[PDB]
Design a protein around this ligand. Structure first.
Ligand SMILES: Nc1ncnc2c1ncn2[C@@H]1O[C@H](COP(=O)(O)OP(=O)(O)O)[C@@H](O)[C@H]1O
Ligand SMILES: Nc1ncnc2c1ncn2[C@@H]1O[C@H](COP(=O)(O)OP(=O)(O)O)[C@@H](O)[C@H]1O
Ligand SMILES: [Mg+2]
Ligand SMILES: [Mg+2]
Lengths: 371, 74, 118, 160, 371
């Protein structure tokens, strides 16, 4: 039979059968209970709208993501999300399909063990396998080397790989991602008068960020230009009218990636953690990693980031090496495409964690040889 | 639950259903008739479970149709 | 748009559909009997010895166990499908209630009954 | 259909009261007793019964194939007594659902004009110009190429 | 059995069995004791004529409404009105029929508790339920969202509802209604010479208001036109002759709704309290409320109000949103039609306050789960 390539993610759940080009169903991972009282009788009001249904009734819900930073903080809601994904968005019972979840690097063990225990006890799948979210993104590019920066919505991690041999001592995981950029944008919009507070209006700020923000090639020059002319002010229409005008908030929101001091984080930007991740590698594979830098994940879709990052790394790196940044147009679904490719391989067909194996060793089987 | 409770129910079902296996103690006629009748019973069970597969497939298709209907509401 | 001719056409289509569905169900029953004969092979014991009955009862116990376990699983599936059917029936019924139930009432139940006696 | 005799022998007093009332209102002298449907429609409209008025006019323009211009007792009398719902049991939901499922071998939840034409070939009914468009009216209540079992249910609900 | 859908209202009591289209008996809610002496013996003179009987003998009575502003100020008279409604206008003993009263939003608790105590002790009904007068008017329109402005004769209230979930923090109740318009019309008629003082002549002024007054599309232009031409002066014949001619009093009486400063009230008109009620709602359901504004209640029957209100709201609202005002022709009985629909529902059949429940918890049961 065919395998189910699910990809929990944090912000958008992407799923679909193995062997295709794009995920079949992509929908936000939010579960929102209603918060008001409700007076109409017999309206058929449910107790929790999940997935894309709660992005249409969000006016009277309190949306809450069940995955904070890669890790899962609310297991009941995550189980509800998985149940919805299997039964309503794909309509395939899990009793007859292997599953291939994905997990960020350096995550707590208990999260992974609970994930496998749920998949084997509640949904009762035949066999499931957990894979690191960066190796798949490297599969999708058709490479076999390269250092991949997978800046998702929950957590940004940077896994270097050479000739198929991952370097476990050079993984640099940073917890700045799309959600923190949404919060920072929502916080700097208040400098013009627009106040978004409700958890429903966070979605509106996210839409503003997606449609308007861009990464500046040079930060100081843009700050000077936006403060003199008015060629940058782009307007946007809220879900009820009252258009708003975003000035130099456009390139200040995604600039947080390269200067995490804006949101008070100490660490260095995504332009310098990649160079540090390279320098921890051996001295003889640094040229190949320099030449095959891969971008993935949703948050790396800002217009103009593949040039800013290249300029920064070229500034840091030695002058002789060639710096090349691979930015495929299908960046958002790169991890899932790689997952489909991996699940479609014949050599991989014996790596699944078969159910009888789980019955013999318990949920701690995932840390064992079947990784 | 949902993994040993159902296991326990099916185990008890097998225990009460699988009667005593003891053959060479009696005349061939009674045991032959018992074996033939139980084979016919399990044949009827095969027919019933096949019809259950057909009907459950039809109701799954109806569930898909009603999912399409509830999707038509938006 | 004709009325009598269209009524006759639709009722004839209904009757033909019903008869064809009955014949199709009869074909389904015939194919069911065919499958029953094929898979659960006929077992003839016309004048055979004891060891034949021993082997037959051993295979009987094995097949009874496996088929009862399989039908236990299939019955679990059928119970889940029944639960889904009831839930979706409630859903569609609530949809119909929202669409049309308020429009259902006894209008002029007594207003037309009492006209001028006042 | 020719259920005129069945209707004239099956009706009860509840509506025959109004039938005889409109009869005496209509036939009172210097008339042949054929009773034209034209005045009968006006009388029934005045009396307060609740049929659909436009369907009777369309039938009058269509029914009575003999083309006399004044429909005789049977057909227009049946259309008049259609105020009472003396219907053909309204069929059954489960049977029609089974019919739709048998037709939905495509397993897509809808029956399109192709399957309608195949059914028409199976019954051998005359090719009618209302086809395809009739599905658009009844089956395509959303104009999407999708028809669930309820559109077919109401397509010929209690058809007779 | 069938349920009794009574609707106390303030000015017209509307009642009838559940499941019909229109109330069976509609009659003013006034109780008038005679005031003169009375010399004929044996004439069979009663001590209080209630309902529609006191609108024919009003020449020698002192009519007094038992409901001032939604609240009930004279419980004995209200009990008399209910007794009349049950026994003479419907002729059904209350011992065998559930009742469904209606109550304005934000009313005093004691009023509701006394109402249920009366219905359970004096009339001894099997079960009664109290419903908010706006949710019913939303039922009758066949909607499930929308913001309903129910401008009755006692009190005007504006309840917004979305997807069946009422928003309790956005109810704007204003005490200007038909009665204040009657008093203001009676006060401005004195500018031509016609003086109405007696409580019986208030009914004549009410008839003048109903038959002649209309809401102007633009107030200043109408004031200028009525002051130059004479195309507006419509005459009306009093109950004894001596026709009167109403000039620009025609559109000045109902203009008080949009400018409550005329009768000295501070608050803003019904054109601006609706917009304020909308703006208190969440940012994502404002479009739906804009598109589904519902009118109900008697006082919204003025010829030309559904255009003035739409013009005003379109002036206030953002230019992109579409403003639509639902004004069904059966506006007056909209609340009662909705009440009939609600009482006819099967899902609602277990929400009644059964008598044994009242016996166990006292009259304070109404504030509990059985709302
Ligand atoms: N076109 C875009 N432009 C800018 N940011 C985007 C765009 N699309 C998505 N994002 C950001 O990326 C996030 C989605 O990232 P995604 O790759 O789905 O995370 P995950 O790894 O959990 O799947 C969104 O929250 C959004 O903030
Ligand atoms: N046709 C009409 N035109 C103008 N005003 C009317 C009309 N009918 C009723 N009214 C006003 O509405 C009031 C009746 O309102 P109603 O809806 O009966 O109040 P309640 O909510 O108490 O039932 C009357 O007092 C009258 O002033
Ligand atoms: Mg990801
Ligand atoms: Mg009212």
């Amino acid at each position: 039979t065919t395998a189910l390539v699910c990809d929990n993610g944090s912000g958008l759940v992407k799923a679909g059968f193995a062997g295709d080009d794009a995920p079949r169903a992509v929908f936000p991972s939010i579960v929102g209970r209603p918060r008001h009282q409700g007076v109409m009788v017999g309206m058929g009001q449910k107790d929790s709208y999940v997935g894309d249904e709660a992005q249409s009734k969000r006016g009277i819900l309190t949306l809450k993501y069940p995955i904070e930073h890669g890790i899962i903080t609310n297991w009941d809601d995550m189980e509800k999300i998985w149940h919805h994904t299997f039964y309503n968005e794909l309509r395939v019972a899990p009793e007859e399909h292997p599953t291939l979840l994905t997990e960020a690097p350096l995550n707590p063990k208990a999260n992974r063990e609970k994930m496998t225990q749920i998949m084997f006890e509640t949904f009762n799948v035949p066999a499931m396998y957990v894979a690191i979210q960066a190796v798949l993104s490297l599969y999708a590019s058709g490479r076999t080397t390269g250092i991949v920066l997978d800046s998702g919505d929950g957590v940004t991690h940077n896994v270097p790989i050479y000739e198929g041999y991952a370097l476990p001592h050079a993984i640099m995981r940073l917890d700045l991602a799309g959600r923190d950029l949404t919060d920072y944008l929502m916080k700097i919009l208040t400098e013009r008068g627009y106040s978004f507070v409700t958890t429903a209006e966070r979605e509106i700020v996210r839409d503003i960020k997606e449609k308007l923000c861009y990464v500046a090639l040079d930060f100081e020059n843009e700050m000077a230009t936006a403060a003199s002319s008015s060629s940058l002010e782009k307007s946007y229409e809220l879900p009820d009218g009252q258009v708003i005008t975003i000035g130099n908030e456009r390139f200040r929101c995604p600039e947080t990636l390269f200067q995490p001091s804006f949101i008070g984080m100490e660490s260095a930007g995504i332009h310098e953690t990649t160079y540090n991740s390279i320098m921890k590698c051996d001295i003889d594979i640094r040229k190949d990693l320099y030449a095959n830098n891969v971008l993935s994940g949703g948050t790396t879709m800002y217009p103009g980031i593949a040039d800013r990052m290249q300029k920064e790394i070229t500034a840091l790196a030695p002058s002789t090496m060639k710096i090349k940044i691979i930015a495929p147009p299908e960046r958002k679904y790169s991890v899932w495409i790689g997952g489909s490719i991996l699940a479609s391989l014949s050599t991989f067909q014996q790596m699944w964690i078969s159910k009888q194996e789980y019955d013999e060793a318990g949920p701690s089987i995932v840390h064992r040889k079947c990784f | 639950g949902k993994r040993q409770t159902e296991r326990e129910k099916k185990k008890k079902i097998l225990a009460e259903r699988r009667k005593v296996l003891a053959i060479d103690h009696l005349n061939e006629d009674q045991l032959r008739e018992k074996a033939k009748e139980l084979w016919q019973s399990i044949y009827n069970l095969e027919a019933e479970k096949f019809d259950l597969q057909e009907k459950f497939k039809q109701q799954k298709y109806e569930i898909n149709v009603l999912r399409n209907r509830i999707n038509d509401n938006q | 748009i004709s009325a009598s001719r269209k009524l006759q056409l639709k009722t004839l289509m209904l009757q033909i559909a019903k008869q064809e569905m009955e014949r199709e169900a009869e074909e389904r029953r015939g194919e069911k009997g065919r499958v029953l004969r094929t898979r659960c092979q006929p077992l003839e014991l016309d004048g055979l010895g004891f060891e034949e009955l021993q082997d037959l009862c051993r295979q009987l116990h094995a097949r009874v166990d496996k088929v009862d376990e399989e039908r236990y699983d299939v019955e679990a599936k059928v119970t889940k499908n029944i639960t889904e059917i009831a839930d979706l029936t409630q859903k569609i019924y609530d949809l119909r209630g929202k669409f049309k139930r308020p429009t259902l009432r006894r209008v002029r139940i007594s207003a037309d009954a009492m006209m001028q006696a006042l | 259909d020719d259920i005129y005799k069945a209707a004239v022998e099956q009706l009860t007093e509840e509506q025959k009261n109004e039938f005889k009332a409109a009869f005496d209102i209509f036939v009172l002298g210097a008339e042949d007793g054929c009773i034209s449907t034209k005045e009968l429609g006006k009388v029934m409209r005045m009396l307060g019964q609740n049929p659909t008025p436009e369907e009777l006019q369309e039938m009058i323009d269509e029914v009575d194939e003999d083309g006399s211009g004044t429909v005789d007792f049977d057909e227009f009398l049946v259309m008049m007594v259609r105020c009472m719902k003396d219907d053909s049991k309204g069929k059954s939901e489960e049977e029609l659902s089974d019919l739709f499922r048998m037709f939905d071998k495509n397993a897509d939840g809808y029956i399109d004009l192709d399957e309608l034409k195949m059914m028409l070939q199976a019954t051998g009914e005359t090719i009618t110009e209302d086809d395809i468009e009739e599905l658009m009216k009844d089956g395509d209540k959303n104009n999407d190429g999708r028809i669930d079992y309820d559109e077919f249910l109401e397509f010929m609900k209690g058809v007779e």
